[PDB]
Amino acid sequence: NGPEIMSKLAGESESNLRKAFEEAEKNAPAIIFIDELDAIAPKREKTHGEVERRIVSQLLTLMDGLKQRAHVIVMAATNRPNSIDPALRRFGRFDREVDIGIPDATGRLEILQIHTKNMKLADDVDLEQVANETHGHVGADLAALCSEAALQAIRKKMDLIDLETIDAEVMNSLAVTMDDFRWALSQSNPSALRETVVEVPQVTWEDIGGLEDVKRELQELVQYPVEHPDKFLKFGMTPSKGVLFYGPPGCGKTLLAKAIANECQANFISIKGPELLTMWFGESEANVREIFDKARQAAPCVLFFDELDSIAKARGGNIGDGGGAADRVINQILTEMDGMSTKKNVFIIGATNRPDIIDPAILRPGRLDQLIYIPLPDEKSRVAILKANLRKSPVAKDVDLEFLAKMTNGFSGADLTEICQRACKLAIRESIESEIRREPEIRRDHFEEAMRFARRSVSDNDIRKYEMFAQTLQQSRGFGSFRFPS
Amino acid sequence: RPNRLIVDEAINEDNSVVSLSQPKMDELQLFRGDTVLLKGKKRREAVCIVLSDDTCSDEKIRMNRVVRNNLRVRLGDVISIQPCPDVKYGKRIHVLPIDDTVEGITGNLFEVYLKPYFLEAYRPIRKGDIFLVRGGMRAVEFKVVETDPSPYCIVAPDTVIHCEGEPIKREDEEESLNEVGYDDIGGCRKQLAQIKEMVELPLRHPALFKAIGVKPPRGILLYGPPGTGKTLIARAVANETGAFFFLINGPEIMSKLAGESESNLRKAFEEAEKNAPAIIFIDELDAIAPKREKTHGEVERRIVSQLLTLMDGLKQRAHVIVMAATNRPNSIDPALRRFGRFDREVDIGIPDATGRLEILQIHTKNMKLADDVDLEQVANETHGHVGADLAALCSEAALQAIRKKMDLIDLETIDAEVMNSLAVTMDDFRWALSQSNPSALRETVVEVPQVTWEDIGGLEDVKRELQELVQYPVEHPDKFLKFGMTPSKGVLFYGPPGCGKTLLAKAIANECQANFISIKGPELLTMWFGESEANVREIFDKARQAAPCVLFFDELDSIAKARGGNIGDGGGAADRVINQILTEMDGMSTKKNVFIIGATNRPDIIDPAILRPGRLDQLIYIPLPDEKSRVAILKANLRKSPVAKDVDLEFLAKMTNGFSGADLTEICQRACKLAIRESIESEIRREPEIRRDHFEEAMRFARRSVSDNDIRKYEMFAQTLQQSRGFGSFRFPS
């Protein structure tokens, strides 16, 4: 234990490290686990004591002495991959690095099922509903949640049957009800809420309508190099490692990136515009490196840069504020892109509503060289939007969502999302009023009432500008009549 | 069973009154004012009269500290009823004080403690009963030594109570009845309830955790500004649960060389282990274990590591809860706040006006006050006062009461009658209020506001929308799951200056009884100028810990104005502080019931990124107040002010056509100030209400703050954001 080692004067600390290693040597195959390694061996520059430096050096020499075939594996856990001595992470000392990371919904469900196996639950405890709304929870947060629910189950039957070395039958007669879990979910306080989510997304191609050419291109750039690595070697040509989505707001760039990640069952990392702006305002663009590290350790991965023009907008427009299109954060992104290998199957997807103001250096080959226009959703995509938002909501069968997607001509996906956000909220309001006066489905009248407040977010001029950009980048030249002679 | 009850804290401070419920009395066949013989643990018993109240449950009995200690039991224990067989009145009943509680005060105890306590109050008395009485700015305990007419009796007016002297020595297994308890804490209901919950099972039911194996909370961290009673709360919990309270003082630990510090931490933990269920309280934790990066000594690092390993060793079922108080949630080692060491965190925080009133009533219970001391007027104008500030205020007033009668009757082991003859007058409190110097004046107020929908006139559609976004997800969480749709977590108020955005946010918070946090434009500008936008995170933390909460960002366009206009200064609409607000909004859950309300007079220059879905996606226009809202403004400002009945405030709100709320606020700020001036002049020449002439004189200086062009621009913005498109004729075919 880090703290236990560092809590013993300036003598016995070194003696205890040495004795631990000697005891592991004398006792056959062994695993030395050094829990909280950063407590023992932090950055020797940030140490301000002689004994701490001796502790780090003693650990280094013990680890070097464990280069023989003594059958002793040394494991170490730290919350600081970048706050332990780099000299420990060299070859022969700590060569292998395993990122545990946040559990996904499946992992959270598994942890909950593990913690509740001994506990006598009820029939209403779904244990999967909680696992889906325990976002930001590490297994310790889930254990705390489970113990909290069990304790409140004991806090409801506390002094009815006395628990005075107490009998087994009363112990077996306990139960935890699902509303206890829903209570604890509001008192959860997850520890890893503010942590980068790296998970295979649940968005599939079904949740996206239309975009047939866009889906084809995306699976050409992502699905082919992953599922057919036999090609790209037979033809001796590396897959492109990046694409730039451009188009009007609310047209499915995020969903397309998520769906292409889910098709290959690849990890998905999303870096939104506020994070790029956080690096830009704070001049902490070094964190770009860390992002790419997370992408490289999670490979195969789709590294998605939503609203990649956020810094360009924050500076003004195409020129910005006096300067050119280059900025420190996008420059770091360019540097990191040049340093990848295309053999890690890390795919960069940048999305921008303003391709005009994007730094052209990011569109060069060996970068986001392919530009895909994500247009305003067509009627099939509108139907998919309505079906996806309306799923999980009880909606009447008589609603003609196909008809609803016919006058929503220039509507974006956010427009239809607000359409139900209004119709379905009117349904909630009507339910509450009828429940007040009294003391089931989204009807057609609710949808007509919502469409009475239907506005197009993206204007005709903006669509015209997007179409013009798409033409000047995709209409190419007059080489459509080319043909080899004979 | 009629002979099995559960103990709860008594609402009132009565010495010998227990509160029960009518259904419990139904199976007992007892009157409202009869006496019963309650038998406690360890063979002890007492006699007490019952009372009826609906706050307690059907099978719960409420008892105060003194009678609970007489039964040798604590909260939640098992106590029978066993009604007394109507024992006749007492004759002599000899009672004597306890030596420790009478030391320092001598004299005749009849007219000061015994007679007033037994005057016009038939209180049952047993041989072993010890009772505490408050008087002479003290709380003194008296134990009965003998009773001639049977061990049980009821005190009669003609009974000749005897107090010879020779106070009895404090017994072995009986604790002091006036040291600390739950009734000594003022208005900390939420926090004290949380602590009681986390602490009940581990300490009151220790064998349960030696037979079940569920992990109870092992580390509780009380944090808040200094003087909020964290040590008091911990001591109260330990005393009420009966667990051994071991106190570790930060400075005391860190004042002992580089040896005995570690030895004392280890010995404290071992002593807590060896002594049954225990609470280790580590007061001033940041003195012992600060950020190990900011430490610059080896012994300090060893202290932190030793505390960490002791806390880890207290992962077993040793029934030892470790409590710690710090004023630094973010200046203690983060490694202490991990799972298994200090998992639970309780924010004590500033007391509200109700909490301040409770604290003042607690500190003045022993003190003999006057009739003019409102004790609620001071509680309403003690803003920024923590309970320590209130204790200082109360002691200051009492001392000045002693500074007015200081050497008239000599206080030479001084007599009790002169001690009981003191009084503190309200003007002393009003004096101390100007000499207060509150410690938590510069602290973020998190309180349920007192503004209701009555204080707002008109805005019927705005009220409806606000309760649709806030009241529905809070009071009807059954919906939004049946329909499978999260409530919107934010709204943006926009409109002209002085139209009730702040009052609307406060009223929607008060309707749901939610906490209200207001972040004004100067604070956003402070973060922007100082580049301390990291504090945005802290703000959201305060909102998350105070959930349900309305997080209000008044004048959210302050940074945009400070930069210029819509463009600003070369750059775009993004700035570091609003970017941090966007980041924090994306990181909330909508299951915390934290609602963000942004207000802006300039929606044109607001960053559009904040209007996107998953953010302040709903925009509500708060227009210039209509005549009903004007009447509400006038009535609300004029309340607390004596205003003549003949004033036609309804008429006054008819020519105030384009007037804003600030305009009418200035209208009375002038009329009512003219009334004050006329009062002063008439008092000078001589040595009651705001008349109509005052209001006409004020309206003679009535100007509209917001011009017609500005109102036109607000209306244009409202049209282009709310007139939508020509989809009003939509209809599904057939």
Ligand SMILES: Nc1ncnc2c1ncn2[C@@H]1O[C@H](COP(=O)(O)OP(=O)(O)OP(=O)(O)O)[C@@H](O)[C@H]1O
């Ligand atoms: N083709 C589509 N398939 C599915 N959903 C879509 C599609 N286009 C839009 N949407 C809907 O739009 C909403 C979110 O849009 P999305 O985040 O994909 O937009 P975007 O193109 O990234 O633009 P922006 O940068 O303006 O947010 C969701 O409700 C989503 O269902």
Ligand SMILES: Nc1ncnc2c1ncn2[C@@H]1O[C@H](COP(=O)(O)OP(=O)(O)OP(=O)(O)O)[C@@H](O)[C@H]1O
């Ligand atoms: N609808 C209203 N109901 C009650 N009081 C109102 C209303 N409109 C204005 N007022 C009065 O206006 C004064 C303060 O206005 P308020 O702080 O609500 O304005 P605001 O819309 O937030 O504008 P600003 O940003 O210019 O201060 C108070 O005296 C309040 O009584």
Ligand SMILES: Nc1ncnc2c1ncn2[C@@H]1O[C@H](COP(=O)(O)OP(=O)(O)O)[C@@H](O)[C@H]1O
């Ligand atoms: N919530 C409270 N209720 C009653 N008294 C209080 C409260 N808070 C503080 N006091 C008074 O303030 C004094 C000092 O409080 P203290 O325990 O030092 O604060 P903290 O515990 O936060 O360090 C106590 O003697 C107590 O009389």
Ligand SMILES: [K+]
């Ligand atoms: K104290």
Ligand SMILES: [Mg+2]
């Ligand atoms: Mg570990």
Ligand SMILES: [Mg+2]
């Ligand atoms: Mg996008």
Ligand SMILES: [Mg+2]
């Ligand atoms: Mg303290």
Ligand SMILES: [Mg+2]
């Ligand atoms: Mg405002």
